[PDB]
Amino acid sequence: MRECISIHVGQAGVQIGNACWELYCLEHGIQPDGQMPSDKTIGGGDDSFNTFFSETGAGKHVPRAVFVDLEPTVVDEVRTGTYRQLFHPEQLITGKEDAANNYARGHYTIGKEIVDLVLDRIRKLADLCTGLQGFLIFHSFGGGTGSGFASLLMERLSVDYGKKSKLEFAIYPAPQVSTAVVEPYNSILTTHTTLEHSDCAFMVDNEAIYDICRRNLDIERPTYTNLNRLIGQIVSSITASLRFDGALNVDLTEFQTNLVPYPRIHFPLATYAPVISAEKAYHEQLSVAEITNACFEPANQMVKCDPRHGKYMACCMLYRGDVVPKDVNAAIATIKTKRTIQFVDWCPTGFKVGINYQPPTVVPGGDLAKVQRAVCMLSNTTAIAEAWARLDHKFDLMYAKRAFVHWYVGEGMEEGEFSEAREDLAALEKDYEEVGVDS
Amino acid sequence: MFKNTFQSGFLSILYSIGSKPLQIWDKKVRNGHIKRITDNDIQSLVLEIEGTNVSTTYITCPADPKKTLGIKLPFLVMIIKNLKKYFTFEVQVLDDKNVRRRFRASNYQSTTRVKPFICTMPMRLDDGWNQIQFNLSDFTRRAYGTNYIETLRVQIHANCRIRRVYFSDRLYSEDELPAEFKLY
Amino acid sequence: MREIVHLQAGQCGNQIGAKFWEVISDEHGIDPTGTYHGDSDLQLERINVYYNEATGGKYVPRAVLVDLEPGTMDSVRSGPFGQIFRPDNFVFGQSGAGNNWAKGHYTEGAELVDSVLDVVRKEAESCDCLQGFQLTHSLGGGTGSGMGTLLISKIREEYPDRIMNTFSVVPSPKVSDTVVEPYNATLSVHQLVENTDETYCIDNEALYDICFRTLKLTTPTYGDLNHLVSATMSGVTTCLRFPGQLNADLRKLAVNMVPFPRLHFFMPGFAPLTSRGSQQYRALTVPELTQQMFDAKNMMAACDPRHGRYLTVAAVFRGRMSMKEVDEQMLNVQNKNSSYFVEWIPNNVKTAVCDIPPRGLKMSATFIGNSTAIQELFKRISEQFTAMFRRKAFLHWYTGEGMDEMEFTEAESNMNDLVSEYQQYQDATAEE
Amino acid sequence: PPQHNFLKNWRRHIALRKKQQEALSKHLKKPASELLMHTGESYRKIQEEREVIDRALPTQHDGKATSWFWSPLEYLGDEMTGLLMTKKKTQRGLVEPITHIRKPLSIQVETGLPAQKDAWYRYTWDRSLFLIYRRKELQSIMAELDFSQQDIDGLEV
C-alpha cells in the first residue's frame, strides 16, 4: 500500500532522519525497544503503522530507510545513542574516506566505490515492500557527501525506476550567512542533476529558521535540534494523509501531479504554521483565516524572498487537526479578493483541501505547544528566482579567476561543466522570467 | 479474387461511372445512405457514402467475408471528395510471416499507434477532391519490418464521395495516367 | 420483480451512497446487524427493490463500490453500517487516480474494469427484470469521473433498454478542489451528453450557503450535505419505493421532463429547510411549500434561475393533503409569473403526490425542474477551459499518458455547440 | 455548422499558439525548442524510452514482474474486524503487448517545429555513460521485448 523509502545522505540528512524517526515513534506510541511493552496502561498505537514501519512475526518494528555517510563519525555518534536497538547496523554504512564539502572526490574517487552495496540494500528494501510511490532523499548542498554521492545515486535511481516519484530535501546556502566557502561550487553542479534528472525539489535555508525562532519562539541561544524538529514537523505534515485518513485524503501523487506545472519549474515554497512556543500558544485564539493569512507573510517564509516581487502560478495547501470546512471556504474567499497577494492572469484559482482528523502531537522537552490544528502550504511563484540569480553572480565572480579550482582539476574532471552549468542556470532563469511575464 | 488474375499497370476495384460500381462490394448502412449521384464540381456520377456514425456506414471488398482480394500491387490510389466530416478507411494485408495486418487511416487521428495486428493512422483531406496514395509495402515495412505480399480486404467508411478506387504497381503522374483515370 | 441496481464511484460518491443506504435502512427499519426491526406495512412488499431476499430474512444491499484507492473501504466499513454490505462488491486497485481522468481511464480502467463488469452482470442476471442503474459519483477526481463514464457507456452498450440516471457533482470556480478540474469537467461532460440518459446537477457551495443562511448550523460538515442529498434521493425514489395514489417512475420523468436528448440536466431541491429553533413554529400547508419550491433561495443552485425561462417542472409531493391546491397553485403561478417559463408550452408543471409520508417527517416534497440557469455554468466552464488550453498548461501529464490533444478540441467544439444551442433555445419566441 | 468548423477551430488555435509564441520569442530572441511549448513531445519520447526500460528492467530483476498467479493478500482496517484485501491487475496472466507513438513531419511543422533538436550542451543524461553501457549490455532483453524498431515520420498523405 502507501509505503515509501527514505534516503539520508550526509550528517544533516542523518540527523533530519533521526528526528523524523523519533517524532514518528513518539507520535505513534512506538517504544525505543522495538516492541510493545505497555501491558499495564495502553496509550495508543492501534493504527496503520505499515506505511513507515514493518510488523514482524514477534511483534517488532523495523525502520525502513537508508542511512549512508562517507564519514563514520556521524554513524558512530548515532550508534552510541539510546535508539541503537531500533534500527539495524546493516543500514548504517560507514566509510574510510569522506568528501566533507567536496564534489570531486565524493563523485568520482569516493562515491563510485560504494555503489553496489547501497544498490543491493535499496533493492532488498524495495522487495520487502508491496506498494511504492516515492522516496524521501535527505541530503544537503553545502555538504560534499550530500552533493556528489547524492547526485550519483539519484542519477542511477532515476534510470532504475521511472514510474516512481522522486522527491528532494536539502539545505540552501543563505546569501548572508554560511558555513563553508566552496558551497556555491557544489551547489552549481548539484542543481543541474536535481533539475535535469528529478521531478521535484524543496528549497530551504537556516537563517529564516533563526529569524522565525527569535521572532516567535524568542530564544537567544538556538540549536540544531529545534531546526530538525521544525523540518520533521514539516515532513510529517506533508505526509499526513498517508499514515492516517480524513475527509479528503491527499496522497503523494495527488499533490505532486499538480505541484509541477512544468518540468523545469518544480521548486515550491513551503511554509509551516503555527511555528510558536508554549507561552505563544495559550492566550492566543487560533482560527484558520488568521493563520492562512499569516502563511503568505514573507516573515513566515523559510526562504528569503518577497512574495510581492513576483506572482503565483500554483498553490498547494494542506491542513492537519480539527479544521472545519466553513473556515477554509471563508479563508479562500478572503484571499481570492486580496489585492496584496499577486497571481497571474491565467490561473484564477488552484488549491487542494486536506482535512486531517488526527491532531499533531507534542514532544516532552521540545518548544512546540499543544495546538489544536496545523497548516502547511506549497506555493509556486517566480519571486524566488532571485536566489538563483545571486548564486549565478557569486559563481561568476568566483570563476573569473578560478578560485579553488585546481583541486577539482587535479581530482580529474572536465572544465567545461562549469560553463555548462552556468549556461543551464542562465536558461532556467530566462525560462522563469518568461513564465513570470504575463500577456 | 485477383490472386490468379494478371496484375500489372492498373487494377480498378471501384469505378463510379461503371454500370455496377458495387458488384464486388458489400454495403453496411445504419442511420445513413449509400447512393450514386452526380457531383456538382465534376458534373459526373459518383458514389456518396454518408452516416451519422462513421463506424456504422461503410463498404467492404470483397463482398464475401470469407474471400480475400489477393492483389499484389503495392500502391492503392483512391479519388475521393472531402465532405468536411469524420472519414476513415481500413485495409487488411498479408505479410511474408503470414500475418494478417490492418491499416486504419482516419482524419481524426494524430499518431500512428502500432499494434501487432493493427496500425492506426492520421491523414489530411483538403477541401474538394483528393487523390490519396497508399504505399502498402512501405507502410508495412515501416510499421512491422515486414514486406507486403497481397491485399486481403479494403473497407471505406462514410462521409466521403468516391470517384475511383484502383491499385497500381507504381505511382503514376497525371500525364501518364490514362484518360479514364484522370479527373477533369 | 422490478428492482433497481445501484452503483458507486468516487470517495465523495462512496460516502454519499453510504449515507443514503443508512438513511433508507433507518427509515425502512433495518438494524445495523442485518435483520428487520421495522413496524410498518409498506416496508415489506416493495422492500426488495434495493435489497435481496435471503435466508432468515436478512436483506442484503444491492450496490457495487468501484474505487482506485484502498483508503476508502477502511473508512466506509468502520461506520455503524459498514459491516452489512457485500464485501465482494468493493472492487479496488493498488494505485490512486491522482485526480487524473486520462490516466485513470487508461491505466486503472483496463485491468480493473473486468471485475466490476463481471459482478454487475451477475447481479443483473440474479434478478428477473430490471429498470435502470443508479450511479452516484463526483466529477472532482479521477475515480468517480474517470470510471463512471466508462461504466455507463459499457452498461448502455450491453443493455440499451435501461435507465441511466446519475447525480454527479458540478464544480464551482469559487469553491475548487483540483487544479485540473476544468479539464476533468470538459472530458466528463461529453460522455454525459453522448452516452447518458439523464444527469442532475450537484453543488457543494450552494448547499453550504443554504445551510448557513437558513439552517443556521454551528459547524456544518460533509455529513450534513450527504444527509441532504440522501433525503433528496429518498424523495425522488419514493414514487417507486412507496406507491400511493398518483405514482410515477424514473423513465416517466426522463421522457416527460426532457424536450431534447442533448439537454438532460435537471435542478433538484427539497422544500422544508428550517433552522432548529424554527421546527416548533411552522404552518403545515400548501402555499408555503409552493413558495419554498418556487423561490431560488431554497434551490441548491450556484446560479440564478431567474436569468432565463422555466422549461420543465415536476412537483413530487410526499404526504396526505389533496390535489386541488397543487393545480390551483401552479395555475396562478403560471398566470402571474408569466415571464419565467416558456410561453409556447403551457402547463410545464407536473403533479405527483405520494400518499405515504416519510419516516420522522410528516410533510415532505422535493422539487425536480429544468430551468434556464445552467447556461452560466456552461459559459464560465467554457471560458476557463479556453483560458487553460490557450497556453497548454498542465498538459504534459495527460500528454504523457498516451492520449492526444484533439480530444480537448472536439470536447470544446461540442461544448460551444451545446452552449449555442442552449442560448438560442433560451429565447424560444412564438414566431418571427 | 458541420465538422469543418471543428478542424478549422483546432487549426486556428494552433496558429494563434504559434503567432503569439513567436511574438513572445522574438521579443527576447530564443529558439522554439528552447522554450516552453515544444518540450512536451520530447517528454513523450522519454515516456517511450520509459516504456522500453520499464519492460526491460523488471525482466532484469526480482519482484516487479514475477509470476503473480500465487501471491497472497492481506487483512487490515483495525487489527482483525474487517476483510482481506485483493489484487486485481495483470496478476491474472495478461500478456500486454508493447505500444509506441511518434508524429509525422508536416503535421509537426504545422504544430510549431520541424522536429528541432534541443540544445547541444544540456543533455548529459541522454549521453550518460550508464545509459550507453546499458544499451550495450541489455541487447538480449531489448531483443526479447520488441524487434520492431520504428521509423514513422514519413507517412503523411
PDB file of N, CA, C and O in Angstrom, chain B residues 116-139:
ATOM      1  N   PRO B 116       0.342  -5.058 -32.757  1.00  0.00           N
ATOM      2  CA  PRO B 116       0.805  -6.240 -33.505  1.00  0.00           C
ATOM      3  C   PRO B 116      -0.116  -6.663 -34.637  1.00  0.00           C
ATOM      4  O   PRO B 116       0.342  -7.354 -35.554  1.00  0.00           O
ATOM      5  N   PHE B 117      -1.393  -6.276 -34.612  1.00  0.00           N
ATOM      6  CA  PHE B 117      -2.324  -6.670 -35.658  1.00  0.00           C
ATOM      7  C   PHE B 117      -3.009  -5.499 -36.348  1.00  0.00           C
ATOM      8  O   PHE B 117      -3.755  -5.724 -37.307  1.00  0.00           O
ATOM      9  N   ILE B 118      -2.785  -4.269 -35.900  1.00  0.00           N
ATOM     10  CA  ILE B 118      -3.465  -3.110 -36.470  1.00  0.00           C
ATOM     11  C   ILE B 118      -2.563  -1.895 -36.314  1.00  0.00           C
ATOM     12  O   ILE B 118      -1.827  -1.773 -35.330  1.00  0.00           O
ATOM     13  N   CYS B 119      -2.612  -0.999 -37.297  1.00  0.00           N
ATOM     14  CA  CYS B 119      -1.851   0.245 -37.269  1.00  0.00           C
ATOM     15  C   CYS B 119      -2.799   1.402 -37.557  1.00  0.00           C
ATOM     16  O   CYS B 119      -3.155   1.641 -38.716  1.00  0.00           O
ATOM     17  N   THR B 120      -3.202   2.117 -36.511  1.00  0.00           N
ATOM     18  CA  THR B 120      -3.973   3.339 -36.681  1.00  0.00           C
ATOM     19  C   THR B 120      -3.083   4.416 -37.296  1.00  0.00           C
ATOM     20  O   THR B 120      -1.853   4.331 -37.246  1.00  0.00           O
ATOM     21  N   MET B 121      -3.719   5.422 -37.902  1.00  0.00           N
ATOM     22  CA  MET B 121      -3.042   6.256 -38.887  1.00  0.00           C
ATOM     23  C   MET B 121      -3.741   7.595 -39.077  1.00  0.00           C
ATOM     24  O   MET B 121      -4.939   7.618 -39.396  1.00  0.00           O
ATOM     25  N   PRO B 122      -3.042   8.708 -38.883  1.00  0.00           N
ATOM     26  CA  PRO B 122      -3.600  10.016 -39.231  1.00  0.00           C
ATOM     27  C   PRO B 122      -3.498  10.298 -40.725  1.00  0.00           C
ATOM     28  O   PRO B 122      -2.742   9.659 -41.459  1.00  0.00           O
ATOM     29  N   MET B 123      -4.278  11.282 -41.161  1.00  0.00           N
ATOM     30  CA  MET B 123      -4.273  11.702 -42.557  1.00  0.00           C
ATOM     31  C   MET B 123      -5.018  13.024 -42.664  1.00  0.00           C
ATOM     32  O   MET B 123      -5.755  13.421 -41.758  1.00  0.00           O
ATOM     33  N   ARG B 124      -4.814  13.705 -43.790  1.00  0.00           N
ATOM     34  CA  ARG B 124      -5.410  15.010 -44.042  1.00  0.00           C
ATOM     35  C   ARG B 124      -6.239  14.951 -45.314  1.00  0.00           C
ATOM     36  O   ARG B 124      -5.888  14.235 -46.257  1.00  0.00           O
ATOM     37  N   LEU B 125      -7.342  15.692 -45.331  1.00  0.00           N
ATOM     38  CA  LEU B 125      -8.194  15.824 -46.504  1.00  0.00           C
ATOM     39  C   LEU B 125      -8.370  17.300 -46.825  1.00  0.00           C
ATOM     40  O   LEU B 125      -8.967  18.043 -46.038  1.00  0.00           O
ATOM     41  N   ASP B 126      -7.854  17.720 -47.975  1.00  0.00           N
ATOM     42  CA  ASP B 126      -8.076  19.080 -48.435  1.00  0.00           C
ATOM     43  C   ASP B 126      -9.511  19.237 -48.933  1.00  0.00           C
ATOM     44  O   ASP B 126     -10.215  18.262 -49.211  1.00  0.00           O
ATOM     45  N   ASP B 127      -9.947  20.489 -49.038  1.00  0.00           N
ATOM     46  CA  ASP B 127     -11.300  20.772 -49.497  1.00  0.00           C
ATOM     47  C   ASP B 127     -11.476  20.320 -50.941  1.00  0.00           C
ATOM     48  O   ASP B 127     -10.578  20.490 -51.770  1.00  0.00           O
ATOM     49  N   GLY B 128     -12.634  19.739 -51.236  1.00  0.00           N
ATOM     50  CA  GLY B 128     -12.914  19.283 -52.581  1.00  0.00           C
ATOM     51  C   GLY B 128     -12.437  17.871 -52.833  1.00  0.00           C
ATOM     52  O   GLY B 128     -12.664  16.975 -52.014  1.00  0.00           O
ATOM     53  N   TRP B 129     -11.760  17.662 -53.956  1.00  0.00           N
ATOM     54  CA  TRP B 129     -11.342  16.332 -54.374  1.00  0.00           C
ATOM     55  C   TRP B 129      -9.885  16.081 -54.013  1.00  0.00           C
ATOM     56  O   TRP B 129      -9.022  16.938 -54.218  1.00  0.00           O
ATOM     57  N   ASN B 130      -9.620  14.894 -53.473  1.00  0.00           N
ATOM     58  CA  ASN B 130      -8.287  14.499 -53.044  1.00  0.00           C
ATOM     59  C   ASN B 130      -7.909  13.177 -53.691  1.00  0.00           C
ATOM     60  O   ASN B 130      -8.755  12.292 -53.862  1.00  0.00           O
ATOM     61  N   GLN B 131      -6.638  13.049 -54.051  1.00  0.00           N
ATOM     62  CA  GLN B 131      -6.077  11.808 -54.576  1.00  0.00           C
ATOM     63  C   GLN B 131      -5.161  11.237 -53.501  1.00  0.00           C
ATOM     64  O   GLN B 131      -4.073  11.767 -53.255  1.00  0.00           O
ATOM     65  N   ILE B 132      -5.601  10.159 -52.864  1.00  0.00           N
ATOM     66  CA  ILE B 132      -4.871   9.561 -51.753  1.00  0.00           C
ATOM     67  C   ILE B 132      -4.081   8.365 -52.261  1.00  0.00           C
ATOM     68  O   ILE B 132      -4.649   7.425 -52.829  1.00  0.00           O
ATOM     69  N   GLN B 133      -2.768   8.400 -52.052  1.00  0.00           N
ATOM     70  CA  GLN B 133      -1.859   7.345 -52.480  1.00  0.00           C
ATOM     71  C   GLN B 133      -1.334   6.628 -51.244  1.00  0.00           C
ATOM     72  O   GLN B 133      -0.816   7.270 -50.323  1.00  0.00           O
ATOM     73  N   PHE B 134      -1.470   5.306 -51.224  1.00  0.00           N
ATOM     74  CA  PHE B 134      -1.078   4.488 -50.082  1.00  0.00           C
ATOM     75  C   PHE B 134      -0.050   3.468 -50.550  1.00  0.00           C
ATOM     76  O   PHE B 134      -0.362   2.592 -51.362  1.00  0.00           O
ATOM     77  N   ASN B 135       1.174   3.583 -50.038  1.00  0.00           N
ATOM     78  CA  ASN B 135       2.249   2.649 -50.370  1.00  0.00           C
ATOM     79  C   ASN B 135       2.210   1.520 -49.349  1.00  0.00           C
ATOM     80  O   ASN B 135       2.905   1.548 -48.332  1.00  0.00           O
ATOM     81  N   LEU B 136       1.398   0.500 -49.643  1.00  0.00           N
ATOM     82  CA  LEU B 136       1.180  -0.583 -48.689  1.00  0.00           C
ATOM     83  C   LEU B 136       2.489  -1.257 -48.297  1.00  0.00           C
ATOM     84  O   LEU B 136       2.696  -1.587 -47.124  1.00  0.00           O
ATOM     85  N   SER B 137       3.385  -1.465 -49.264  1.00  0.00           N
ATOM     86  CA  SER B 137       4.653  -2.123 -48.965  1.00  0.00           C
ATOM     87  C   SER B 137       5.502  -1.284 -48.018  1.00  0.00           C
ATOM     88  O   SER B 137       6.034  -1.794 -47.024  1.00  0.00           O
ATOM     89  N   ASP B 138       5.638   0.010 -48.311  1.00  0.00           N
ATOM     90  CA  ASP B 138       6.441   0.879 -47.459  1.00  0.00           C
ATOM     91  C   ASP B 138       5.817   1.030 -46.078  1.00  0.00           C
ATOM     92  O   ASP B 138       6.525   1.008 -45.063  1.00  0.00           O
ATOM     93  N   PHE B 139       4.492   1.186 -46.020  1.00  0.00           N
ATOM     94  CA  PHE B 139       3.811   1.284 -44.734  1.00  0.00           C
ATOM     95  C   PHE B 139       4.035   0.028 -43.904  1.00  0.00           C
ATOM     96  O   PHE B 139       4.327   0.102 -42.705  1.00  0.00           O
TER      97      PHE B 139
END
